[PDB]
């Protein structure tokens, strides 16, 4: 009974960990070990934001953090000058049982024609998080913007650059070169918006949700630490949706408890067979070899 299986390179035979620790990097192996321990055991913390370029890892903002970022609004009132362009028709909200500077909403055109409420992109100006949450509940896509000087500009990259219902898309604060909002006119399709096109139209390098864990693997032959950076292949659970779904995180809780069950000794632990790759690092004056799991998924059990 193996807990994980290989999704590729199955022709490979198993290599014991004693051999791997003695060898060079980079190389790839097939192993079969037991999960002695894992970090972080707080699985709410294992979900991070990853940039495919700078390779940074940052935490996912809590609703409290997102509250403070949005509550500030910006440095000025929404410039009435920047309304009803050749890109969006605008409606200004009030402070009338509503809060903020002045909540302005800009419905980007479907190239001349306004959309309905079912497939429309919204630019909201100086809105609190609660106002953004209600509007993202009614419309498909929402972007937090702010009045700059010559054009609307994104609020801040610490806030999501695109909100589609309950999914929050973030960008890299160091690899991105923010373009002003008018560049959204270069979008081909103006009825459906995916984050890749929106981010590039705005010069944003989109972050990716990832599980980040360090498995301590032991086959009795030796002990090895393997990194897991995964979207949705390993656990077969989307990391972009696990942080907000009580069942998703529970079934991930249950997979870790299956690999490394508390109160149980290592004999009853199930075998994890994985495909790992080694790579070099200049860890101090010496030389470390780190290991990462690839092409490995959990076996058939929910
Ligand atoms: Zn980056």
């Amino acid at each position: 009974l193996s807990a994980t299986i290989l999704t590729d390179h199955q022709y490979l035979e198993r290599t014991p960990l004693c051999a791997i620790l003695k060898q060079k990097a980079p190389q790839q192996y097939r192993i079969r070990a037991k999960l002695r321990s894992y970090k972080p055991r707080r699985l709410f913390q294992s979900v991070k934001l990853h940039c495919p370029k700078c390779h940074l890892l940052q935490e996912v903002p809590h609703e409290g953090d997102l509250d403070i970022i949005f509550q500030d609004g910006a440095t000025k009132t929404p410039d009435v000058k920047l309304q009803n362009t050749s890109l969006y028709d605008s409606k200004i909200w009030t402070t009338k049982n509503q809060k903020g500077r002045k909540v302005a909403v800009h419905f980007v055109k479907n190239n001349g024609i306004l959309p309905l409420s079912n497939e429309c992109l919204l630019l909201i100006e100086g809105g609190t998080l609660s106002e953004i949450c209600k509007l993202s509940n009614k419309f498909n896509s929402v972007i937090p913007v702010r009045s700059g000087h010559e054009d609307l500009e994104l609020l801040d990259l610490s806030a999501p650059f695109l909100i589609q219902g309950t999914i929050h898309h973030y960008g890299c604060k160091q690899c991105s070169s923010l373009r002003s909002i008018q560049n959204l006119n270069s979008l081909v399709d103006k009825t459906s918006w995916i984050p890749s096109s929106v981010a590039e139209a705005l010069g944003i390098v989109p972050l990716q949700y990832v599980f980040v864990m360090t498995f301590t693997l032991d086959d009795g032959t030796g002990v090895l630490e393997a990194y897991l950076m995964d979207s949705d292949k390993f656990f077969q659970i989307p990391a972009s949706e696990v942080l907000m779904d009580d069942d998703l995180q529970k079934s991930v809780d249950m997979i870790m408890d299956m690999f490394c069950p508390p109160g149980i000794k290592i004999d009853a632990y199930p075998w994890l067979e994985c495909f790992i790759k080694s790579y070099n690092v200049t860890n101090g004056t010496d030389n470390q070899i780190c290991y990462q799991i690839f092409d490995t998924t959990v076996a058939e059990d929910v």
Side-chain angles (χ1 to χ4, degrees), residues 51 53-55 172 174-175 205:
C51 178
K53 258 174 254 191
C54 69
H55 278 96
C172 180
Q174 325 263 311
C175 298
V205 174

Side-chain angles (χ1 to χ4, degrees), residues 49-86:
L49 289 172
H50 173 69
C51 178
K53 258 174 254 191
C54 69
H55 278 96
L56 253 56
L57 287 177
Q58 78 189 56
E59 223 75 15
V60 182
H62 302 36
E63 281 170 299
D65 310 334
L66 266 158
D67 205 3
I68 299 319
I69 313 307
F70 278 128
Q71 197 199 6
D72 294 333
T75 37
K76 219 161 128 181
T77 357
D79 197 340
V80 184
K81 167 260 162 293
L82 292 163
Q83 320 206 197
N84 305 83
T85 80
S86 56

Side-chain angles (χ1 to χ4, degrees), residues 117 130-140 142 163-166:
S117 197
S130 70
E131 301 159 317
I132 303 160
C133 290
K134 297 191 247 182
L135 277 176
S136 68
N137 282 339
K138 194 197 310 182
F139 306 103
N140 186 241
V142 180
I163 297 192
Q164 289 182 322
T166 76

